[PDB]
Design a protein around this ligand. Structure first.
Ligand SMILES: [Al+3]
Ligand SMILES: [Al+3]
Ligand SMILES: [Al+3]
Ligand SMILES: [Al+3]
Lengths: 393, 393, 393, 393
């Protein structure tokens, strides 16, 4: 398994560029130059690279420096052919965003954050990004009395709808993807899980161009099923982008390589992205974006090892996932457990609530005790998946 | 603090009626007769009682027995004046619901579950319930390959929309409230948090009459902020009912008395239900339903102690919450932290995205470093709330 | 992968006999005859069977019944060749044990629990068991003021020391294994994790014959690394028994098949059991016991499938973990990362504290920034391990 | 509530000196001069101050600088009267400690870490500290194959025993306190909880002078009951120090003010520290040390407010916990629940195992169903405690 650009593997500049400062220590690696990052990613088989405005252009850079940076960055894209499919804004590192960007209690920080986003959409358009991600990492609180909870959501809506109207107004070919996170850096973040994010989009004026950017480790921090969560987003037509990594449990965000966290969950994630639904339905066709960090204990050889590892993990899982579904023993196990039977409507074509109510066979003369003897054989069906995962079938 | 019917304290028949069988042992108390339950609740100052169809009428009861039970149950309501504000269906105890009601892989169980719900709506209407709760406790899986995740949500939609159309069709004055739960009894339940529940309602044909029934302990099982979660439901106009109890951490569901779990969170929950939002907005006007279980170590004196305790806890918190907001030191602390400033729109009346972009004062000439020096004083504001909670101010 | 009695797979009678009742619903399966379990387990490759006194002999059994039941069970054992390596006592099911056995607040109850345990030591002795397990499931509290925590540990000690002294006195070849568990059925359980279990053993008069019985799921219920916990028990030579199962996060105890929870963790537990420590150390040589529950969704084919799945899972992980450590590339990766270097003593032979502080090479002239450049290459070692787990190497 | 030096409130220099940098953003506050901290802490009622060698003396400090800094700090101490009860070492910040100090895989690094600790014992000795804390923050792994777990505990033991022997050898009046932590900065940390800390002490050659330094938040990070964990440390006479702060669940370490996390748990920790065990037992008599961080949202008034809030929180809980145990109703409730009864030995004076099994009253003729009727009334005791906490009694 060697990745190729058709695999659609994209990586953020901040992933491989992560130098190692954590909350208990300083950087263990030297800064990575962005041009070197592009050359190196391209050589590993990456299709694209993504970034945050301040990942490339310093917060204080002059207009001269911005243009110098962009010129060399664009030259490296040209030299390699790496695309830039998603752009995002840093609304969390500088001290001004300590209470948030869009939901900052201070009004002058809310306008500064939103103006920073609007300018960044212009850069997104210019780079040819299809997706603009919004991760509201400082939107939230440590204490419950800190915020007017209704005002926080009106202010979040205002920012997202202003940005959305702006795209529509300039006719940029871009969609906004919100990225939910339960906590860290705030004690509680607004729109904590896939569900809150999706619910919030339905209250928006320009909801039609706003979708989601779920991250594996983020839903796992609330102990949620990531395949269940992305299935709902997909079902709603709202899975616009995805961030893949590993998390081992509810604890700080680890950002491990995809597959180095909950492996069985990683397998079924890949089955849903690659294979879709057993009875048919929607499919995710976007880039497979790795949002992780190379462990601070490792040197630059480990940084490129880790980038490679993300792509290998995905291709090994993909392989096992295609052999699993293709397996006739598996298809028959699925049929026994009622996987395809769930696809049939409960009601008959034209049957009404009254009809079903008044159908003695479905209720009054129904044998509940006979119906309960059914062996769904979910254990055996799970054993078949693990055996394909273990490369034993 | 003595509760009165105007307090709107409702209790489920299964709460006080919980006999003590848990996963590791049998019942430690004798069955509680439902007529005795009504008489006793009414005497404690409860306004209403709620139940599950099989809490009152056995699954196997004949038509004769159903009518006998209802006649005595209605007589006790009459004798005491307790209302019945919410009715729900048991779609989880009998062995036929082992894979779920509405999302059961077996089609004949899906029709049986839905017919059971339709008949129960008819009883809800007859009792004068305003709300019909749907807790899909067996909808989900232990293993990821068990279900077609898109089919599971189409089947969930079908059941809820059939039930919704049925109410609309008979002109019952009822709303459906969905009750999200992350896990237990299933390893993963569909619509795990407030957010998934709200997102799901926007995909429904008859969404207009479907809202939520959040439970304190349920959101706390995913480590979520219950006040944040109910704030979003309220903001969306979807908080139709609420279940109050205590949970101490991510572990099995405890169902403790309200206030016996996360006390500081209980305080702010009460502040939101009683006081609403600091800048004004929506308010929750429904019943304050206690969904808990009296600890199995205690006898029937403890059962009535626990019921009383729920109402006392709420009234003590209420008191502290009204004194907290009324306090001029607190109102000034709030003003300093920007609680009211969050209420102001980011944009000026008529300002456009372009206008804000091109306003040098909000971006190009903005002093980010000056703006970052603001002491939001969130610590001090939190210390004032705890001091009111501790009854020291 | 075909298990043979040489593998030492032991099963509890309660595992495959679990009937399917949980907190939200009734049993989905009929009771399992003990004779049948013995015969079925012997035909799958099991080595032995374990039980709780009440799994076999009802609480209320008359003497005649006890003899009968035991006659039936010993016959089965004689007929099949199964061993009985561990025997345990139920101090959790009867309503009298609602506050614990040993740490019950009621003294008369404490005395009955210990009496119930002493009698069970005789039985364990008679069955030829090597290990006697103590799972204090009801020892704990829901509320912090319910117990005097110093007196609960004194009471616990009294119980365990009385049982240990009695073993020594009777000259039985039995060791006690304490089984830690953090919560469920109680809100908080005493001796919640392997460390708390080991700490307590050191305060016991007869701690020489007292050790641990860690269970996979229990440790994962507190979010701890099961492999690290059994390494500490092994290290102190206190790993007397082990309970293998699966758990998919911090939630209710799932009791899934071994390997059906966290797969990589399972993989590394099998490497520790089979391969021991990279530098040498104690090795675990007891039964590999599965304490799980066949999902309640599955009927009786599922029950024997799930029993089988345990042993298959173990044998597949073992194949992989043996291949993993035998690989030259893996051994090279381990050397590079300093796995072997960890085994060298920090100090030199007869080097003292004063000798080392004084040594300029070690401190005063130690080049900290050049030392910090070492690429530990832990990511690459982890990728190598996963690739062996997926059977791609 | 005004703290006085008699209260023994100690603060780390790093607590109020925390600058606000975290994993997603830069410092929000300027560095705090050590002299100022000392003077500010003395004016608020602090009793003492603690530090890490590098909080005070930079890593690269020349000798002249070290003398200067120490001259400045001892002057402050002399001027204010503050004590220095605990001194600790930073084995986590420099990039050389990326794999740990004591359990680093690199031997040269292990030797530097121990050398760095030995030198710091001299300094601790010179400052007049009673306790020397060891927080092994980088001891652990992200991945399961990174370490030989038996060799990591040998390496740890070597380090701690070398330090302990050296103390004994120099005749210093210092005790070592090990500080357990489950995760962060590493994915898994060695000796993760109070039980694991206590277990390890028992395998040490000089364990007589080695004890624990439990922190509130750390134990809550694994979801454990902090009050139960310090009761076990107390019970074994191993509670040498304590770190008080707040944590709002299983997530990143928050370091909130003491009482700003789980309030009821805090309440019961203060009852244990102040009131001791209901039946008598050891009492904790050391410093009440706050290891927290002023939220990064707050400016310097917030910093002194947060320092103040710690001591106010402690004094309010103490007032309440003293009132709680003095209440006649509460004492009556405790008797009823068997709190005092737990303290009576299970066996009778000179009663043996054989004596008890033989006793018909205790076993053979014990009426288990009548015993089971006892109403323990734990809910009512809990309601009583909360009412004292809320100041309504
Ligand atoms: Al991301
Ligand atoms: Al409920
Ligand atoms: Al077990
Ligand atoms: Al500390």
């Amino acid at each position: 398994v060697q990745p190729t650009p058709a695999d659609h593997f994209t990586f953020g500049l901040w992933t491989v560029g992560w130098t190692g400062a954590d909350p208990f220590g300083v950087a263990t690696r030297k800064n990575l130059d962005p041009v070197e990052a592009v050359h190196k990613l391209a050589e590993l088989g990456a299709y694209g690279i993504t970034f945050h405005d301040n990942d490339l252009i310093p917060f204080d850079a002059t207009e001269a420096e911005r243009e110098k940076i962009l010129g060399d960055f664009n030259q490296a894209l040209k030299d390699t052919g790496l695309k830039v499919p998603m752009v995002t804004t840093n609304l969390f590192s500088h001290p001004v965003f300590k209470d948030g960007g869009f939901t900052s209690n201070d009004r002058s920080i809310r306008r500064f954050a939103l103006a920073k986003v609007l300018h960044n959409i212009d850069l997104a358009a210019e780079m040819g990004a299809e997706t603009f991600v919004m991760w509201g990492g400082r939107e939230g609180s440590e204490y419950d009395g800190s915020k007017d909870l209704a005002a926080a959501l009106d202010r979040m809506r205002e920012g997202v709808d202003t940005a959305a109207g702006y795209i529509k107004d300039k006719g940029y070919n871009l969609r906004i993807a919100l990225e939910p996170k339960p906590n860290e850096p705030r004690g509680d973040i607004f729109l904590p899980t896939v569900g809150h994010g999706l619910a919030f989009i339905e209250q928006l004026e320009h909801g039609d161009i706003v979708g989601l950017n779920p991250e594996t480790g983020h839903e796992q921090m609330a102990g949620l099923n990531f395949t269940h969560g992305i299935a709902q987003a997909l079902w709603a037509e709202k899975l616009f982008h995805i961030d893949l990594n590993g998390q081992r449990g509810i604890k700080y965000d680890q950002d491990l390589v995809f597959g180095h966290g909950d492996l069985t969950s990683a397998f079924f994630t890949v089955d849903l992205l690659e294979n879709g639904f057993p009875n048919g339905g929607p499919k995710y066709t976007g880039p497979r974006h790795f949002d992780y960090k190379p462990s601070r204990t490792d040197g630059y050889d480990g940084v490129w090892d880790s980038a490679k590892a993300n792509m290998s993990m995905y291709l090994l899982l993909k392989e096992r996932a295609l052999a699993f579904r293709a397996d006739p023993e598996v298809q028959e196990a699925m049929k026994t457990s009622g996987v395809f039977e769930l696809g049939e409507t409960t009601l008959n074509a034209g049957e009404s609530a009254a009809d079903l109510m008044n159908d003695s066979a479905s209720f009054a003369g129904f044998d509940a005790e006979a119906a309960a003897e059914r062996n769904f054989a979910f254990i055996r069906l799970n054993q078949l998946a693990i055996e394909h995962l273990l490369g034993s079938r």
